[PDB]
Write a structure and sequence with these properties.
seven-stranded antiparallel beta sheet, homopentamer, mainly beta, eight-stranded antiparallel beta sheet, 4% helix, calcium (chains A, B, C, D, E), secreted (chains A, B, C, D, E), C-reactive protein (chains A, B, C, D, E), binds calcium ion, acute phase (chains A, B, C, D, E), 43% strand
Chain lengths: 206, 206, 206, 206, 206
């Protein structure tokens, strides 16, 4: 397990082979989660890209956080989708926290510490635990079948995952980088594998 | 009596059956009131919605606080209406306080602690006490006949009602959430009934 | 004499009969003056309106402070006009101080503590003492012949008048509401008569 | 010698006769200078105007600081011109400092404490001591031949002149109005001659 | 060695012959570098210009930092180019730091302390040390063959070079002008030769 603190993964070249795979010590299926990650790319005005792809043997978009050009953030669970329209994107690092609860279907999406309105998605579903988690690519099979036009170019870091919906107060401490304990996927205790042109570098964001 | 402090009602999906009814322990008719409530929705650019709807068996728009698409806030009492035109809408939680006095007919409308110009509506009228208060819908009968195109999608909370016009200073302490005592409808002592797809969740706003 | 501190006159409907008349104990004619007042209205994009009208039996526009739509402020003394162009105007309460000196004819106009450039008007003129001062209407005869399209809708207060040009430092004190001593017309010691639909209410501005 | 501190010259009418002449106790020609001044006018969007005219028997534009409509500031020495483009202009008092060095021909222009890029003008030239310094007008003969379309309307003050290029640090203390010692033309100790409609008034800028 | 602290080179005319050449003690070739500098010019809207130009007898664009009109910054190493698009640009001094590493090919570009996204360029290349470094011009032969349409006009200073990629934290102390030790090219210990119309003056930026 590596402390990746103060570091980011860098995807400096457009490739369909470059990705990192994150491994979860996960067993019980997720009835709810929060995923938070900090990323930086200039593609936002150019094309869509996959921020965070979680896949299962049955479902290649089991969780996907996707920037879709001109639309904004696409958040999709169990192959279903909602949009959080973004009117004008800015060339700066962006922190996102997004969380989903099966009991209510409530999705929260938080961008740079400000909440988007809660939306309903896929009420009562369960996210499978037998998961392939990938950064840098969108996977259309379990751990594979990437597309070059969907790769992330730029940096991703602070990828942390919880099996419960963080409260707004908790999410604020994440955004301020207070101390917190991710119990599904922990940037301070990460397990990962690297393929292709990918690098570990000091994080550009504070 | 429930303390709803730091909690909001969430209407996550458009429907004509999800609503909350609020119960007022009210005997005398109102010669004046202040309604304050804090709400959050992204519908504003898209369609109209009922923020707060007070009805009586003789009048289905006895008090209505309504967002009119492209217009702004519509405030109407006793079936008559005035507009507080809003030039451009931010996508953020908004706190409104509206107050009406029969003796003068003066309407005060306050948005995020800044006053709109005072306007005249229904001088000498009186609002009935035997009333249905509903959040999330506009009611065209004494407690029913909603319309899906008028349902609120998003969050509402801190709904407080007084049987008198708050001074500007008092309204400022509401907006800052200083201590205050609502004597018609109190968020810290609320009595309510939930119907349909409505959830109680931590408030997104501070 | 009434302390009107913290209070404003409210003109909540368009009418040609709602006005207040202010009484000045003047005897000696004015060679110079400053008038300061704080007002709030939403008419500014809609139509022109009289802010402050001082009339004498020979001259209905002996002093007029007038908002001319798309123009901005019209300041007129002795029936003669100068324009302080305002290109776009915020929907907020506005403090104005305007000072005129016969000896030089210099007009200073101050809006929310910022000076406009000094302009010349009616060098050597003198404003008569035996005067009718009216708020909310434009006098086309000595104390009468109002026009509905020229009435103020909204609030006016802190109306203070001096028979001398305040220095810029003094005017900055007025803008901050420090202690000051108006020696022609004093909000803290006002003499007035109310006519028609007009109300006295807590001031909305700080 | 008069202390003009906290005072400005006011040119309230457009005219070709109102000007003030400033007397320099100047006995050695200038190989370099700094001139700094505060002025305030609304002409900027309307027409060109003479901010500071320094003339000699040999040349009527020995130094000229001139606002030229839609262009911005024209700075000219020895009859030759450079422009400092100002794309959009604000209705506020403006402080300028401008300093020229013969040895390098470097012109520094500073507006409200921010430097414009250094530019070259009249390297090796020598500005004459036999000087007519005029405020409010552009003099096209030695102390005369004004043009009404070129007069300043508004205020000018704190005119200070040095026979050397101030460092950026010194310029910053002028902009903040720290204590300083002008050794050519001193507002603390000015010698001046007023002609026509010009007034001395308290300064409007801080 | 000269301490050039608080000082800048000034290029006040467009010319072919105005340049300065900088010398390095360097002998071992650069597998990586950081170059940081302050420059100030008004050309950005008008034409392209060379900010920093490092050449070797094999390659006249061995490192080039170039402003290309409407593009923004062009960063080129070994004759190969990448763009950091700048959407809109304004007349202020600008601090840039640019760092390249052969092992990864990662380019960092920092403008006024904010990072641009890391990009890939000329992975595994090696930059020769037997080098001509020139400010003010772009050299298309080893120390020669400039073009007037590519000269810098305005100021350049604080030119510091390291043979390693500064961390983000180190680059932040450069931007704040903390103490630091450039081990290739040091503004506090500079060796240089001046040709043509060039001057040394107090820096305009803080
Ligand atoms: Ca997929
Ligand atoms: Ca795909
Ligand atoms: Ca109704
Ligand atoms: Ca309805
Ligand atoms: Ca009149
Ligand atoms: Ca009239
Ligand atoms: Ca001339
Ligand atoms: Ca002329
Ligand atoms: Ca070249
Ligand atoms: Ca070239």
């Amino acid at each position: 397990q590596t402390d990746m603190s103060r570091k980011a993964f860098v995807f400096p070249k457009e490739s369909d082979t470059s990705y990192v795979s994150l491994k979860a010590p996960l067993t019980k299926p997720l009835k709810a989660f929060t995923v938070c990650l900090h990323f930086y790319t200039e593609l936002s005005s150019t094309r869509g890209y996959s921020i965070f792809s979680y896949a299962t043997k049955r479902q290649d978009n089991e969780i996907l956080i996707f920037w879709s050009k001109d639309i904004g953030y696409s958040f999709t669970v169990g192959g279903s989708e909602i949009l959080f329209e973004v009117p004008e994107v800015t060339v700066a690092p962006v922190h996102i926290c997004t969380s989903w609860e099966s009991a209510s279907g409530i999705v929260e999406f938080w961008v740079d510490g400000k909440p988007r309105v809660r939306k309903s998605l896929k009420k009562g579903y369960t996210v499978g635990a037998e998961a392939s988690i990938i950064l840098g690519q969108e996977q259309d099979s379990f751990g594979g079948n990437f597309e070059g036009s969907q790769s992330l170019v730029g940096d991703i870091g602070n990828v942390n995952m919880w099996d419960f919906v963080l409260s707004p107060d908790e999410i604020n401490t994440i955004y301020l980088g207070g101390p917190f304990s991710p119990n599904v996927l922990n940037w301070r205790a990460l397990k990962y594998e690297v393929q292709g042109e990918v690098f570990t570098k000091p994080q550009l964001w504070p």
